[PDB]
Structure formats: C-alpha cells, structure tokens
Ligand binder design. Sequence first.
Ligand SMILES: O=P(O)(O)O[C@H]1[C@H](OP(=O)(O)O)[C@@H](OP(=O)(O)O)[C@H](OP(=O)(O)O)[C@@H](OP(=O)(O)O)[C@H]1OP(=O)(O)O
Ligand SMILES: [Zn+2]
Length: 407
Amino acid sequence: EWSYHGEGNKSLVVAHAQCVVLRFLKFPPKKTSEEILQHLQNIVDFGKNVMKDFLGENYVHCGEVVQLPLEFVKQLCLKIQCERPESRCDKDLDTFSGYAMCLPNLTRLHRPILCVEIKPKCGFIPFSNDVTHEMKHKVCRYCMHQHLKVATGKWKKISKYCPLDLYSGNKQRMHFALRSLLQETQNNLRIFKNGELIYGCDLKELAHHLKPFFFPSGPHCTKAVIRELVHVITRVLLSSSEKARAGALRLGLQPRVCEASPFSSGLPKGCLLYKTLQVQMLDQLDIEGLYPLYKRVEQYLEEFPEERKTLQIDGPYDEVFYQKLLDLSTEDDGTVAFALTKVQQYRVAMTAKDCSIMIALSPCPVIPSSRLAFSVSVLDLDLKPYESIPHQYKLDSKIVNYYSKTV
Ligand SMILES: O=P(O)(O)O[C@H]1[C@H](OP(=O)(O)O)[C@@H](OP(=O)(O)O)[C@H](OP(=O)(O)O)[C@@H](OP(=O)(O)O)[C@H]1OP(=O)(O)O
Ligand SMILES: [Zn+2]
C-alpha cells in the first residue's frame, strides 16, 4: 500500500498510492522515543512559526506529527531496502520509535500532473569583511564545491549550473541554469509525472514522457519538448502573487554575477526565489565570520549548561524565537546576546540554503500560458542544528583551499 518516494541523509519519504507521504528520520547502527518526538515536533513548530512568516502561508505546507504501529514500521522497512540507493544505505530507517511526519503529497495534488523539484542552493556570493580568502568574493559556494565532489567521486563531472544564474532575474540566464541542471542533475533536479520519478535519480527519454504534456499530430523534436519545460519553469519561478507588500526581511542585495559561471536588474518581489533569497541573506557575516561568535555562545553555555534549555537553543521555535531573529543590526557589542542572535539567524539561513522547491504543472486558478495550472511549494524546512556550525567552518576552508589549487 506504500511505496518508496526518495530520500536525503536526514529523512526518507514514502508515498501513499491512495495523497499523503511520510517523512521518516534515519540514524546509523541511537536516540530515545521521547527525543524523536521533540525533534519532529520542532520541525512542525519551526515551519509554521518561522518559515510560514518568511516565505508565505501557501508556499510552506506542513502536516502534523503521527504515531504508528511499530510492527508496521518494521514491515515497511524490509520492502524498501531494494529501492534505496547504495550511496544512502549507510544509515538505517527510524524503525524503533514508531513516530513519523505526514506531509501532503505535492506530486499528486484523470489529472495528468508534471512535477519539478529543484534544490537551488545558495543564491548570493558573500560580501562580509570577515572573509579571509579572496576567491570567496568572486565565486559562489556551489561552483567551488562542485570540484571537491567530482574529485571525491560523489558525481561523475562538473556542473555548469551556477545558482546566481537562477537567482538573477534574467530569463536567458535562468534558462541556461535550468538547461545546466538537466545536463547534470546530481541532487539538484528531479522530475516526476503522476507520482513517478522520471529523471534525476537520457535527455531524449525525458521528451517521451513530456510530449503528451506540452503537445497533447506532431511532429516535435526533443529540442522543442525540452525547451517548453525550461520556459514554463522559468515563468513559474518568476511568478508572484505579492509584488506590493513589504517582506519580513528587507535585506539589500549585496555581487550579481559569478566568475565561474560559463554563460553568455532582479527577481520579482513576491516570487518564492526572492523570498528564499532573503532568508539566506541572514548570514550577513560569513561563516568565518559567524564561527568566532559560535564559540562565544559555546563557552557561555559550558559555564552555564542549564542555560541551553532556558535560552531556547534547541527549542521551542515559537513566536518569541521568531521575534529574536528580526534584529538585523550587524555591529558587534561583545555580548553573548548579540552572538546568540547571529547563531540562530545563520542556522535559519543555512536551512533556506538547503531547501528544495516543488513546482507542480497540470491542465486544466493561476497559469503560465494548453494553459497549465501550477502550484509552487518549498521543502526540506527543518532547522539545522546548533551543533553542526563547527563542521560548516571546517568544510568552508576545504572547499576554498582545494578550489584555489585549481584556480
Ligand atoms: O545528501 P546530499 O544530497 O548530498 O545533501 C546534503 C544534505 O542535504 P539533504 O539531506 O536535504 O539532501 C545536508 O543536509 P542535512 O540533511 O545534514 O541537514 C547538507 O548539509 P548542511 O546543511 O549541514 O550543510 C548538505 O549541504 P552542504 O553541501 O552545503 O554542506 C547537502 O549536500 P550538497 O547539497 O552539497 O550535495
Ligand atoms: Zn557560481
């Protein structure tokens, strides 16, 4: 009755054939049942108390936490193991707790429905005066990283996608980047049709499944069937129902073009990319940067460990947590309070930098112009842990220093 639907390293999704999925956690071969509730509960809290503000009520969809029979979680886990990539069989499924989270299936909701999930990654190159390496002001994080992934053997080759192409307003750049994602999908593009993964774990094999959409006789080459996708997706990304209202974060745009991008005024105010980009800007300092402040908070919390709970570090992510994030002032007064605020803003921006966007297309409310009804949603919105900020500091040095070798 349930089927594998995809995963990352934090969670696993399985779809109901008869329109809801289930997000299951995944640990190695260690936590308690009490612990796992709070974690999942915080993700719900965070979503509706923080992200629902930053990205709008209809973009962020959440569903409540559920409890299920423990034998039933054992009886699904064994079936799935053949479906899961060998890469992600390092970590096992959350089988013991019996808890899971139920999100509505965006792929499903007679209706032929095409779905494009993107993991756009970071849309800006850092501007902060904390950055010690020169190359970080010229090249984006994504483009530098790509090197170390291919040298590691995570992916077979370099991607020509730069996120700044996609996060720029320009349709010609946005098309190029979308073309570049289709050539090297990696974990940045997946395409679904009627609840089924049809692309990014053959350019011409895609056109077989997409011909019935954009041309419902003939004759249309793959070049045509692919170009409509690129154009439709670009229009839906430049779509907005809120060109007027003032956002929560009014962070000013500060570089517009990456040096590494092989290609050749701004994003619409209400569009999901623009709202996603603002949340990412909360990293006003760099990690270089934010890490000194992390240690300032850390040494305080080690002096006073009961403070970790009372200062809402790992929860609750409630209406007061939200309001603390609003203080944009960047000039350091040497306090814990200042250092703590920036640590929480970074974690939030860190979560906006790893999130996926789900674009649904179906004919048939709202339309790019037969004329295709569309919805736009955002995913992977659970807060990055406080504890992982040192890992991000160390990883930042490695990407830059290795890429700097390659010049
Ligand atoms: O497993 P990957 O496809 O390589 O993706 C990972 C993963 O994100 P997903 O689980 O959503 O796929 C990490 O997120 P966590 O699950 O650990 O929270 C994230 O790590 P951080 O947010 O801690 O940075 C990391 O991003 P990054 O590479 O920027 O460190 C990102 O990897 P890539 O996007 O680089 O593939
Ligand atoms: Zn780039």
